[PDB]
Design a protein around this ligand. Structure first.
Ligand SMILES: *[C@@H]1O[C@H](CO)[C@@H](O[C@@H]2O[C@H](CO)[C@@H](O)[C@H](O)[C@H]2NC(C)=O)[C@H](O)[C@H]1NC(C)=O
Length: 169
């Protein structure tokens, strides 16, 4: 039938959360403007797995997940090369057999960079203890600031019947 439009996360895109509190947005059974999280963004690095970047925003999917946070160059490079570090061990980790895209874009901002460096998370997981999270965010104030990129992790699910996420033209 006639699908609704998914609302793009403009607000979180103009101010990405600290990686310790990365945010997820789930897109399902809707029309979505992919340009907001791809073309319109000032791209620093776009890396895709299971799909080409030129094909990404042109087809439909079973579902689309957007994970948004900030990330500095070291952690970004380790993320791309799949090398373990504090970011992927304690803050945000790609799921097994990741199908989708990593989109890093310019924020032109060197700021407090709140990254957990203890208490391991599982892939696709997050820190859940609010007290500890608060200590990480607080500790960010008393540690070197980092020059930082925005990061949108786009997880794709293959189309399988009706109720899809389709791009706007
Ligand atoms: C990105 O931020 C991390 C901290 O979240 C920085 O990590 C430090 O990196 C140096 C080497 O450059 C290590 O000796 C330190 O032990 C690291 N500290 C922690 C707490 O992990 C990293 O340097 C930052 N990268 C940039 C380019 O600013």
């Amino acid at each position: 039938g006639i699908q609704s439009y998914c609302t793009p996360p403009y607000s979180v895109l103009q101010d990405p959360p600290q990686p310790v509190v990365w945010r997820r947005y789930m897109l399902y059974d809707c029309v979505f403007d992919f340009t907001v999280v791809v073309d319109s963004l000032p791209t620093h690095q776009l890396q895709c797995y299971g799909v080409s970047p030129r094909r990404l925003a042109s087809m439909c999917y079973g579902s689309v997940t957007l994970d948004v946070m900030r990330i500095n160059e070291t952690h970004l490079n380790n993320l791309f090369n799949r090398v373990p570090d504090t970011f992927s061990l304690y803050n945000y980790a790609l799921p097994d057999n990741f199908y989708g895209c990593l989109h890093a874009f310019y924020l032109n901002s060197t700021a407090p960079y709140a990254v957990a460096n203890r208490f391991p998370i599982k892939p696709g997981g997050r820190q859940s203890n609010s007290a500890f999270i608060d200590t990480v965010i607080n500790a960010a104030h008393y540690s070197p600031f980092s020059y930082v990129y925005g990061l949108a992790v786009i997880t794709l699910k293959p189309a399988a019947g009706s109720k899809l996420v389709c791009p706007v033209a």
